[PDB]
Amino acid sequence: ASVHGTTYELLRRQGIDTVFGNPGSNALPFLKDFPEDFRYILALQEACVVGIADGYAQASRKPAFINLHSAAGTGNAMGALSNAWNSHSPLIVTAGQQTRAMIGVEALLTNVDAANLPRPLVKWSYEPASAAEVPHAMSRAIHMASMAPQGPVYLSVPYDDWDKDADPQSHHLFDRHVSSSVRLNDQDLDILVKALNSASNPAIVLGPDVDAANANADCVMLAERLKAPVWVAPSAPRCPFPTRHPCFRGLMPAGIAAISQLLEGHDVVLVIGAPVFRYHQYDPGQYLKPGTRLISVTCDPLEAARAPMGDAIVADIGAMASALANLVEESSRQLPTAAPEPAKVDQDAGRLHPETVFDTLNDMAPENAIYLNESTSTTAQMWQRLNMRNPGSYYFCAAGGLGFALPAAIGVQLAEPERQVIAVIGDGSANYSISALWTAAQYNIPTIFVIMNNGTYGALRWFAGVLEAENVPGLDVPGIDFRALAKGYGVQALKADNLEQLKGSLQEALSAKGPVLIEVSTVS
Amino acid sequence: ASVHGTTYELLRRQGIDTVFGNPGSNALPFLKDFPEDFRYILALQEACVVGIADGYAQASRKPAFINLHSAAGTGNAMGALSNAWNSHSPLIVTAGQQTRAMIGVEALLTNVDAANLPRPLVKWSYEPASAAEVPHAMSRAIHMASMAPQGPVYLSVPYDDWDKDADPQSHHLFDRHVSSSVRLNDQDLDILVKALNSASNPAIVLGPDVDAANANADCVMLAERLKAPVWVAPSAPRCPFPTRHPCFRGLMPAGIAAISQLLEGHDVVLVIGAPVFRYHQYDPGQYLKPGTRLISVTCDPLEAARAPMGDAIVADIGAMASALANLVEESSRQLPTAAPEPAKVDQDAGRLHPETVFDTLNDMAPENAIYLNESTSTTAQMWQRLNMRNPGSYYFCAAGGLGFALPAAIGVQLAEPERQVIAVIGDGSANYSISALWTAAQYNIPTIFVIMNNGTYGALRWFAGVLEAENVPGLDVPGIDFRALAKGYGVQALKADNLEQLKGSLQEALSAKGPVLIEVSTVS
Amino acid sequence: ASVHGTTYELLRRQGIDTVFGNPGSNALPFLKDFPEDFRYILALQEACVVGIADGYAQASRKPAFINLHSAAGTGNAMGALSNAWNSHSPLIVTAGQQTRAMIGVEALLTNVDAANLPRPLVKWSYEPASAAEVPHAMSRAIHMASMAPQGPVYLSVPYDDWDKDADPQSHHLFDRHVSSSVRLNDQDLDILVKALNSASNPAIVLGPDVDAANANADCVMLAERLKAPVWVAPSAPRCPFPTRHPCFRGLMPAGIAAISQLLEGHDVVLVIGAPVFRYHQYDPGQYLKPGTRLISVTCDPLEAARAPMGDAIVADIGAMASALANLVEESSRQLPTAAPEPAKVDQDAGRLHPETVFDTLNDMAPENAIYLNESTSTTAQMWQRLNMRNPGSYYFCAAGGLGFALPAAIGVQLAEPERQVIAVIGDGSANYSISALWTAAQYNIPTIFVIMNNGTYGALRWFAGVLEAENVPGLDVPGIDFRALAKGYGVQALKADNLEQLKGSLQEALSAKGPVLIEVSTVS
Ligand SMILES: Cc1ncc(Cn2c(C)c(CCOP(=O)(O)OP(=O)(O)O)sc2=O)c(N)n1
Ligand SMILES: Cc1ncc(Cn2c(C)c(CCOP(=O)(O)OP(=O)(O)O)sc2=O)c(N)n1
Ligand SMILES: Cc1ncc(Cn2c(C)c(CCOP(=O)(O)OP(=O)(O)O)sc2=O)c(N)n1
Ligand SMILES: [Ca+2]
Ligand SMILES: [Ca+2]
Ligand SMILES: [Ca+2]
Ligand SMILES: [Ca+2]
Ligand SMILES: [Ca+2]
Ligand SMILES: [Ca+2]
Ligand SMILES: [Ca+2]
Ligand SMILES: [Ca+2]
Ligand SMILES: [Ca+2]
Ligand SMILES: [Mg+2]
């Protein structure tokens, strides 16, 4: 067998059937004879390739496979890999390298010192020392991406390796099963359960690895048993809990003092599937108030090590959430009371308040819609205004790297064809990965893109205002016609300059058979 | 003085007056109070930021200064840095980091292990250990980018450093002059001159560092004295010689055997300002034929070390070219005969042959036009069909990384406001950095963009044909309306479906007062 | 030809004839059939291997070739490489890797991610992608080590590559000549010469790259012409000037304020072949006083970039020193007056003051002796008390890494068989690389080792005293019998408990036919 044939067999046997890519000559011997049971999804720039694959992996809860061209293609994707690292996204990034005979002279298209290129944003990065090693290296990549804590990996493969003979002993790779589905030993688990049962005023904080594990329902059971309020850890990449459940208390503000004050009076705070914590703004103060004990369950040693407070348990989130949900006592305390309806912001017949947009989406979208957020000045209001009952309903760039949501929404929609995806993207953010729109058109992936056009990098103008920072350049982005950009890439385009038109455009978009972009004029 | 004030003083004293950027919160304390004598050039994605800065640096022959946001912004620019590394572009890449107090917890927006991120594509990469070190680190960055061999450098700066007190002793940084304007010692230079004077059939090969040094005219003198044919080294990022000079022999094919055969019978081959060699295709054979001696003059130790053949001298290209041009004898051999006119390809009233496009550009464009090439299947014909008399007239992605020419053409045009820039970009290539168009519109930088629309990644289809590789996915890019994309970003848009319309559109574009995009329907 | 045969041919053709090594199985296919024209020098631990090679390279002014075993052997040598980096020592470090078929499984003896292991202490670090690349990679290593600024490089080679067929086109590697023997262009050199000729009170500071270049005599001429005092840059790894020449002013103290005060009133300070500056102690103040201009000539861009003050010129030290020495005017100012005799410290009939040891060495040793210093509390007195007339007469661990001088003295003695080497090593320092003694015995390399036994890490006790730091552990090293250690490794051993015995032992040692260790009881 060739390295090509053995590698595709390995991929298929390991459940991979899609290649997200932007092609180049170094990968031609890999892409030729492309198997009929695989699908190739082309995107026009590598940030888009990786963002699409990332959304697909996150929504499908399975690894996604990528093929890029050399250093330039890898390089173009490195901002996307920063997000993938923070979201624990299981991405297998392969990159075509020059033929081994041309590497020493540093021929054009050579990826110099290739494995160092994507560091520090990958779990594992490698170039095999021989062609016959390639299937084994691919196996390593699959499992490194897939083991807890999941994350992106990188494999560089010389052009000429594919046609070479594989090791017949590579068949042993095909059906390997590798599990990290582990939970705390019984003795120490019983000690934790007892501490939860004994808490007088517990609280729960949930992060993105809950949603990745589909541990949401187990966390609902846990919260109901403990009669505990539930917060989403700050800077949330995903939504881990039904947002109209009576225990839900919303998104924690990303500040040290803000969080310890929210947690004050809670004697035990159980954090599941989050870093402790993904703070953002400078908000100095106490990590916890006196009287609060924190216990973190994380899938990631690097998270456990860096928490500034609390105990930690490093284990699989799904296995821990299921165990805890089934072992805790039913508390006799009263269930928390649901948060009220948010207020309706007054809206005239002019430009749209963001709040109006989110209220209208919540009203009109299917109850199993999936939202993406890259509208950076409006996140808090979005989280208060969307009723998201189901898992897998929300994604936000986990490293704050713009250019995620537009391509990721395409990958999520590909993963979840029955669930309408609605990406709410600022006018600034929309440009980073604009060319991803083409993939939605070409493959008829019916994502809806809602562009929040306020003319500015509003979150930066706001921050500059908080600082009283004057004379800051580069904060405005006038003069972008998003309907023309959508036409450029073959996506149906609508506008909404007022609420009547927003409702009209949403109605049209929700019934369309293809992707649709709606440019919304929002208050600036 | 603050670190902010001292750093801007250092930059101004070192000749920097422009910041190419995409802003973020980590850089707000750097960008606030932006000096009135500086200009900020915003671009919408970091590949575009760096490509614009790169064109500006390459054309201006001086360092360009960049400011990006954290890991995601840096990451989005890493494909652009792959090109900058290969072109020896003096780029000072700064990236905003989190406040030092929030780095340990890995707050959102922290650039983890920041200095490793852009490796291996930078000459120097650093994060200072204290605020007062920042001006010194900036000095290091300026000089590392600027010393031969020039190249990109990276500096990560925590948010909170800018407002801190600077070291008063940082004034010693302001006026440092650092020179690498060096040439071979007299004794060994005389030995080289004697070998050149004694050669019976010399040839000269020139690379991009000649044009970077503005050594072009000295190389013309050298070639005339030696009566030597002159080739451009393969995969050429720049044009180092007048392309209708009688000695000019064009672009070398990027193959081992092809080059040794071209050089056969030449007893001494003098290579100046190129790697030996930037081969591309697999073309195995002899590095040199018997009877050919190669001598390389390079500004880059890494080039000298990796050449598979020949002697080398590591020195400044400008200083070596001037010395050699003035020291060699005038040979009594006959001057080489100019290459003939290329043939005119037959052209019907339909879609344009690329050859027709280049012939028409050569006819219509000013004699001091500057061309960029990212039309990958047409490079050989472009090089034969454009009379480029002047230095600084040609740029091509030096690492083969697409997404260079569109933004770089904007930066070149900004550097050279009196010289009409014409970027010839394939339909595939145009997408990688499409959003750069906006910068041209916003700042009214009057670049002309000629999109070669053949519907495909033609260079890849061709290669697949050479291989007889079947069933390769992802090679076609139908369904892109480049006039709509140009409208999206505020750039005047024209079409050319036939030669009459090409001439009409070029006439209109050449007289426009702003940037213009022309979508050309080319034979596929 | 095999890779083995081609590689040894390359090494011989490039002037390499000695392999400094500690063997292992991964290197057996390299070491077998060891050519009869090469010599292998075994040392018992890899810090010793590299230190011996380093002394040999520094004294011989040519690259030295090393072979180590995998990661553990490389790792054991990394402290030695820290010194080699700071001394610009041209060291070609090769390390045996596992067979390519066993690398993926990470068999015992695999060097994982090998090229990253010695970073950041090497100029270039690499593992070839195929066997036939190995000769080319070796060529790269030779030239990278040898080009200015010289330094250590690393090459990892899989076991199985050696027996494979080489590329016949690797013959083009054999006789490559690569030069970095460059100096400032004439126009700018004339500007520098004019500034030197116009200075009213110039001073000269010289660093180790002067001695490496054998630029010493040119610097003497330069100093005599300019009538300038000459200092050695701080933390000196080498001696660049005759220490009883009338211009000589000794070793600069390694502090910021101390140096600017020494330079006060000097209008132009010319630094040659040094960093600006290798400060050590915290001594804050002005980098230069008002009225002092500094101009640095350095072979190292990294030095030029990081200087906090002054202009810089990056060029070959030998070529610049020769040019400047021959171009400056003869000043009419008076020649500086020689420094007086240092005082004689009162010495009773008991333990030896270090000053007494150095005075006695200066009296008794041949005028062409070579000294090494790893007696860290006595450096200033050593520099004042040894008349070192000739180049190549002094070495001190350039990164401050102990374990250098004992092995390096063996390599220096091997390089310079006619010059008696005398290594003055503290009792603490002697242990780091103690096993190097064996190599001197086995090869009968007649180095003299003078162990300064004060029972302590005296430089650390002194520093702790300056700080008034109490309760510091680990500063004393009682209970070491250096004569027994010398016997252990087959080296003749002497003691000196008083001055009479010191003179007796030195007399015996100087006339011995083999290496000799003298344990001196020094005042503590
Ligand atoms: C790749 C990248 N570049 C720059 C930024 C900095 N950035 C920028 C540029 C923001 C403004 C986004 O503007 P928008 O129009 O998408 O949304 P708002 O107007 O609601 O802020 S928010 C933010 O962190 C980033 N996070 N990621
Ligand atoms: C960033 C990046 N991604 C992918 C490639 C691979 N690539 C691709 C995708 C090419 C086709 C470009 O198509 P085009 O339409 O711009 O021009 P032609 O149709 O004339 O080839 S040529 C080439 O090397 C690359 N070099 N750089
Ligand atoms: C490898 C290494 N380890 C530790 C040190 C720290 N160190 C130590 C341990 C010194 C004392 C050396 O003691 P000595 O006996 O050799 O000489 P003195 O008694 O004259 O100080 S000086 C110094 O910097 C070092 N520089 N290098
Ligand atoms: Ca409602
Ligand atoms: Ca699915
Ligand atoms: Ca906005
Ligand atoms: Ca014509
Ligand atoms: Ca200009
Ligand atoms: Ca095309
Ligand atoms: Ca004396
Ligand atoms: Ca010798
Ligand atoms: Ca001691
Ligand atoms: Mg990296």
B208 Cα–ligand 9 center, Å: 25
| CA distances for C323 relative to A243, B38, C248, C498, angstroms | 78, 41, 21, 50
| d(CA C446, ligand 11 centre) in Å | 14
Instruction: Give the pair of three-digit tokens for residue B105.
Output: 């917890």
Angle between helices C78-86 and C46-60 (to 10 degrees): 20
Nearest CA among A114, A110, A121, A342 for reference residue A244: A342
**Distance from Cα A388 to the centre of ligand 6, integer Å:** 24
Contacting chains of A (3 CB pairs or more, <8 Å) are: B, C
Residues, CB within 5 angstroms of ligand 12 (ion): C 426-428, 454, 458
Inter-chain touch A474–B23, beta carbons under 8 Å: yes
Strand partners, C179: B313
Which amino acid residue places its CA nearest to atom 23 of ligand 2? A24
How close, in Å, is residue A5 to chain C by CA atoms?
Answer: 19
Q: Report whether residue B22 contacts ligand 1, using a CB cutoff of 6 Å.
A: yes
The C-alpha angle with vertex A188 and arms to A184 and A193, in degrees rounded to 5, equals 95
Domain B179-340: assigned CATH number: 3.40.50.1220
Give the gap in angstroms from C-alpha A227 to the nearest C-alpha of chain B: 30
Q: What 3-state DSSP class applies to B13?
A: helix
Nearest to B152 by CA among B41, B30, B68: B68
Pocket of ligand 2, beta carbon within 6 A: A 22-25, 69, 72-73, 76; B 79, 375-378, 400-403, 426-429, 432, 454, 456-460
Which residue, among A156, A373, A404, A435, would best test binding to B if mutated, counting the most B CBs under 10 Å from its CB? A435
**Structural tokens at position A348:** 């005239």
Residues ending a continuous segment of chain A before a break (C–N > 2.5 Å): none
Judged by CB atoms closer than 8 Å, whether chains meet at A127 and C129 is answered as yes
Length in residues, chain C: 524
Q: Whose CA is nearest to atom 10 of ligand 3?
A: C457
Instruction: Among the bound ligands, name the one nearest to the CA of residue B462.
Output: 2
Rounded to whole angstroms, the Cα distance separating C512 from B509 reads 89
Reference B178, options B150, B154, B197; nearest CA is B150
Sign of CA dihedral A330, A333, A334, A339: negative
* CA-based torsion, B360, B363, B364, B367: positive or negative: positive
Whole-number Å distance between alpha carbons of B159 and B131: 10
Counting from 1 in the atom list of ligand 2, the atom nearest the Cα of A109 is 26
Check whether domain C341-524 has CATH 3.40.50.970, yes or no: yes
DSSP string of C224-269, one letter each residue: HHHT--EEEPSS-SB--S-TTSTTEEEEPPS-HHHHHHHHTT-SEE
**Which residues from C are below 8 Å from A130, CB to CB?**
100-101, 103
Distance C358 CA to ligand 11 centre (A): 27
Task: Give the integer Cα–Cα distance in Å for A192 and A206.
Answer: 17
Ligand closest to Cα of C361 equals: 10
Of all atoms in ligand 1, which is nearest to the CA of residue A461?
21
Beta bridge partners of B96: B69, B157
Which residue is associated with the tokens 């031969």?
Answer: B148
In CATH, what class is A1-178? alpha beta
Q: Which amino acid is residue B57, in one-letter code?
A: A
Q: Ligand 8 centroid to B494 CA: how many Å?
A: 28
Q: Give chains near C: 3+ CB pairs under 8 A.
A: A, B
CA distance A154 to chain C (A): 14
How far is it, in rounded angstroms, from Cα A245 to Cα A387? 9
Pocket of ligand 3 (CB under 6 A): C 79, 375-378, 400-403, 426-429, 432, 454, 456-460
CA-A374 nearest atom, ligand 1: 16
- Give the one of B173, B302, B305 whose C-beta lies nearest to C308's C-beta: B173
| Cβ-contact A301, A169 below 8 angstroms | no
Protein residue whose Cα sits closest to atom 19 of ligand 1: A458
Tell me whether residue C456 is annotated as binding. Answer: yes
Tell which residue, A257, A286, A287, has the closest CA to residue A271: A287
Q: Do residues A397 and A237 touch, judged by C-beta distance below 8 A? A: yes
Under an 8 A CB cutoff, do A104 and C133 touch?
yes
Relative to the alpha carbon of B402, which ligand is closest?
2
Cβ-defined contact of A136 to C104 (cutoff 8 Å):
yes
d(CA C358, CA C381): 8
CA dihedral B259, B265, B271, B277 (to 10 degrees): 20
The two tokens of residue A273 are: 């599937």
Q: How was this structure determined?
A: X-ray
Which residues line ion ligand 8, judged by CB < 5 Å?
Answer: B 415
* SS3 category, A472: coil
Cβ-based contacts of B402 with chain A (< 8 Å): 72
Hey, which bits of B153-267 come out as E strands? 153-158, 178-179, 182-184, 203-206, 230-232, 248-251
Which residues of A fall in the annotated binding site for Mg(2+)? 116-117, 119
The answer to whether A29 contacts B441, with C-beta atoms less than 8 Å apart, is no
Q: A81: which chain B residues are within 8 Å (Cβ-Cβ)?
A: 75
Distance CA A100, CA A127 (A): 11
- Residue with the smallest CA separation from ligand 2 atom 24 is A24
User: What H or E segment, with its residue span, contains residue A81?
Assistant: helix A78-86
Instruction: Test A101 with C137 for CB contact under 8 angstroms.
Output: no
Phi, psi torsion values for C269, nearest 5 degrees: -115, 120
Helices A46-60, A405-415: axis angle to 10 degrees equals: 40
In angstroms, what is the resolution? Answer: 1.0
Q: How far apart are CA A496 and CA A480, in angstroms?
A: 15
Q: Where are the domains of chain A?
A: 1-178, 179-340, 341-524
Closest CA to B324 of B200, B206, B148: B206
Tell whether ligand 1 has an atom less than 6 A from the beta carbon of residue A523. Answer: no
Q: Which residues contact B348 (CB under 8 A, 6 or more apart)?
A: none
